């Protein structure tokens, strides 16, 4: 018995994604490769955001990712900022940005 | 005392793949789980709408690829499509 995630080489669960797609009432039928593709895309997005979050955490001399690191990662990357534009991260704060005219 | 499915272990596996040394807090893990669920809902809804528009009764890899192309910005979408097609090719090869 070999899991579908192992066959596809991914870390996210293909079977769980298939169950969620079936039970989510999205279509009458769900294709075989759709959960694999969706798991791959989810894993890639998680990898990107976690890489940026870890870079922020290292820049902050911290080993564990806190929500502030995730917020800094999302807002500093233009593509992730566009993807998560209408999203508020709890205990995330804001980017340090003081306008030039206000400076002495 | 009841099962509550979550992406905690999978997110941790991906984090260890990317950063073997860094860690994650409970609030941060909840945020990551919410992000994964939100992206899943977005892609699934876009795929369902795409299937409905073309009068198709199934969600295939093409529908999710188009959904990813529609949702994600340029480089993110391109790299995500590359990763997804690599995964699907490997899955078909493994049978």
């Amino acid at each position: 018995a070999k899991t579908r995630s192992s066959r596809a080489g991914l870390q996210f669960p293909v079977g769980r994604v298939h169950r969620l797609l079936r039970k989510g009432n999205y279509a009458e039928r769900v294709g075989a490769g759709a959960p694999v593709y969706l798991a791959a895309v989810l894993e890639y997005l998680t990898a990107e955001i976690l890489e940026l979050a870890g870079n922020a955490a290292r820049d902050n001399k911290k080993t564990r990712i806190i929500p502030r690191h995730l917020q800094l990662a999302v807002r500093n990357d233009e593509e992730l900022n566009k993807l998560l534009g209408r999203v508020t991260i709890a205990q995330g704060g804001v980017l340090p940005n003081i306008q030039s005219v206000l400076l002495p | 005392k009841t099962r509550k499915e979550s992406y905690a272990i999978y997110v941790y596996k991906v984090l260890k793949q990317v950063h073997p040394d860094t860690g994650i807090s409970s609030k941060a893990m909840s945020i990551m789980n919410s992000f994964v669920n939100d992206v899943f809902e977005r892609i699934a809804g876009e795929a369902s709408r795409l299937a409905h528009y073309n009068k198709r009764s199934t969600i295939t890899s093409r529908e999710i690829q188009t959904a990813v192309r529609l949702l994600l910005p340029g480089e993110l979408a391109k790299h995500a499509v590359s990763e997804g097609t690599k995964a699907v090719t490997k899955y078909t090869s493994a049978k």
Binding site: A47, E48, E51 | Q17, P20
Partner: peptide, 8 residues
């Protein structure tokens, strides 16, 4: 162990 080509 994992690197993304988006950050080159």
């Amino acid at each position: 162990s994992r690197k993304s080509m988006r950050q080159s």
